[PDB]
Amino acid sequence: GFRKMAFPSGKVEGCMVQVTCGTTTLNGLWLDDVVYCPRHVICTSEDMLNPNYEDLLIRKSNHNFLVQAGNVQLRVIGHSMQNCVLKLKVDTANPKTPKYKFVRIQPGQTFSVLACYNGSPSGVYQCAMRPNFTIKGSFLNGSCGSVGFNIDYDCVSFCYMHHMELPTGVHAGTDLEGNFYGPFVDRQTAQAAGTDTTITVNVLAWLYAAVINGDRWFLNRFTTTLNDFNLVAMKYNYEPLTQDHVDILGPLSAQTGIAVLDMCASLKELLQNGMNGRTILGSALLEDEFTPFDVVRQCS
Amino acid sequence: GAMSGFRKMAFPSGKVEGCMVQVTCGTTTLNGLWLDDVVYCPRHVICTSEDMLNPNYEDLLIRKSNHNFLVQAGNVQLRVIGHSMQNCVLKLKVDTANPKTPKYKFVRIQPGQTFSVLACYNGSPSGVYQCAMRPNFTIKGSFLNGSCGSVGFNIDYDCVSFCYMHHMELPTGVHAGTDLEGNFYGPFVDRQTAQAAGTDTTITVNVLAWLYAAVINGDRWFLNRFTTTLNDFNLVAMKYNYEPLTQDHVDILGPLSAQTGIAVLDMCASLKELLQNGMNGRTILGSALLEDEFTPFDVVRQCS
Numbered sequence A: 001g002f003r004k005m006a007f008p009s010g011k012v013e014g015c016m017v018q019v020t021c022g023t024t025t026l027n028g029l030w031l032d033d034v035v036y037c038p039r040h041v042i043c044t045s046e047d048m049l050n051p052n053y054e055d056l057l058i059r060k061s062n063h064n065f066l067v068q069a070g071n072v073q074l075r076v077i078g079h080s081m082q083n084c085v086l087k088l089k090v091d092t093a094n095p096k097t098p099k100y101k102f103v104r105i106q107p108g109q110t111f112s113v114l115a116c117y118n119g120s121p122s123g124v125y126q127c128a129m130r131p132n133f134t135i136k137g138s139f140l141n142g143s144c145g146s147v148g149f150n151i152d153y154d155c156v157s158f159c160y161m162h163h164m165e166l167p168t169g170v171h172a173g174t175d176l177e178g179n180f181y182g183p184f185v186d187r188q189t190a191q192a193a194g195t196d197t198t199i200t201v202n203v204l205a206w207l208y209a210a211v212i213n214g215d216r217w218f219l220n221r222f223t224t225t226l227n228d229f230n231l232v233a234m235k236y237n238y239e240p241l242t243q244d245h246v247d248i249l250g251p252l253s254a255q256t257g258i259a260v261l262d263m264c265a266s267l268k269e270l271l272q273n274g275m276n277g278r279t280i281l282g283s284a285l286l287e288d289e290f291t292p293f294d295v296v297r298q299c300s
Numbered sequence B: 001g002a003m004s005g006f007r008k009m010a011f012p013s014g015k016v017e018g019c020m021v022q023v024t025c026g027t028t029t030l031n032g033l034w035l036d037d038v039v040y041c042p043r044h045v046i047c048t049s050e051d052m053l054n055p056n057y058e059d060l061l062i063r064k065s066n067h068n069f070l071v072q073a074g075n076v077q078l079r080v081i082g083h084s085m086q087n088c089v090l091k092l093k094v095d096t097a098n099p100k101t102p103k104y105k106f107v108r109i110q111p112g113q114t115f116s117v118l119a120c121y122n123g124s125p126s127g128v129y130q131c132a133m134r135p136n137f138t139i140k141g142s143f144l145n146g147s148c149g150s151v152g153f154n155i156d157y158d159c160v161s162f163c164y165m166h167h168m169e170l171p172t173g174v175h176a177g178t179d180l181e182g183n184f185y186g187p188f189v190d191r192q193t194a195q196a197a198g199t200d201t202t203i204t205v206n207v208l209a210w211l212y213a214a215v216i217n218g219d220r221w222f223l224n225r226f227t228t229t230l231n232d233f234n235l236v237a238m239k240y241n242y243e244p245l246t247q248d249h250v251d252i253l254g255p256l257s258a259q260t261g262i263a264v265l266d267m268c269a270s271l272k273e274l275l276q277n278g279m280n281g282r283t284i285l286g287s288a289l290l291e292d293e294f295t296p297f298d299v300v301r302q303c304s
Ligand SMILES: O[C@@H]1CCN(c2ccccc2)[C@H](O)N1
Pocket: B044, B047, B051, B052, B148, B167, B168, B169, B190, B191, B192
């Protein structure tokens, strides 16, 4: 009985708004007296290929920005651009503003996404930053302007904003300061995501989760050296494993008594021989969207 | 296409977050649902540690007065003014009506249908997940220590349909519970006596809708050229522990059948080949597993 969970989305729900520039409509994040949204909302049908965003920006008037929060309309006062994020300053501060911080995450860390359409929240899901810096999600998993977040002691950490739907069923976007995740541009040009890989630290964290839940058949008597594991793992499209990840797994190593490189011999053996029709925590597949600290959060 | 790399989503939990409270009777603390002037919670909050095998709820309840119930809404304390029992749900009338009460209904679901769960510690929401009422009337849930009182719901046009409440963890690691009228799902009792869940089965109708969703989005490698009779399909499915398929499930799938031009029974023959051959490393809609927790209602709603 181990299931993936998203954060309670209430505190982010009361921040989504609908931003409309000319013909284009998408989601905004209304915080204090500022609305954040992707900067490509200003792209016309003629600049949508090769725009000089800051010069296009300075020529738009505030009045070309429609902002509604449900039935209420918001007054745009000014606008500035920070990287690929548009910042529209409004006359009203959001009284539903949670306590928040802007953070940037690393490939392999998890967060929840509140999927929104035209400002209206539609659903919520947990995901991980893929090593190729993309996030799994169809057009039905929330369109441009939806945000990704973690909650740390009732404080929201916004880390992600959806910008564009890639052809491969994944989407890409930025942090809330506008910097893209991965080698992507907000220009409607042919663009492809790199070959993905399995988040190796997360699989080990998930294997520790099985051991906490008494699922133990995969554990063996063997260890392995770090790179004697890495060599085998990259041949299966697994992320190489750094000394940082080992340390991060330390606390789980101390609760279960399974050294990190011991569990690495279990996973390495799982890679070459498969699960032989057995199961771990109910799944015939290895999960890699549980960080070490999602396990400690949900198991302590 | 539309649903390439599609993920299940739980509904936004905000409207439920504003209804969760902490209910305490003596030494037990669990979650309550505060809707208007009444808070709902599982009745086994009034059990002691000796009462858990054969609790006499009617004896236990009548011995309790309003001021033995400790209802905490965040940082305010609510005053209990009345208290009655409807099956296994306890109902605490409070003097103060929840301002954050959403539009809501109480509905009972059938196995195979889906909803979201807001998992809570001590009145405090901890997470949200999307799941299905399994065919054996249990909920494969999170390894949360005291989720009792966590509710399940769907949301449809600002209106929250409450359909589940968590009462107990079973030895098999899944959860069992009631509707908001206190009737359990399945043959379970709110007693700490030996209770086992029947053998789980794959929600066949859900898989077929999922397979129809793939075909809508050009994912097409699993289709074959065969049809099957309904009863020839049902007979093979069962030795793979798949739910038998009823004519009603065939009708439910009819809209998917017409938009793709693939007869339902043809899709059943394609499924039957997937069972004898398997998905060993291959993907359907980005998933390396056959999804059985996405209903035909959400497929046709989301793929018009
Ligand atoms: O999940 C656990 C298991 C079941 N539950 C319980 C307590 C008293 C009588 C019957 C059931 C307990 O409070 N919570």
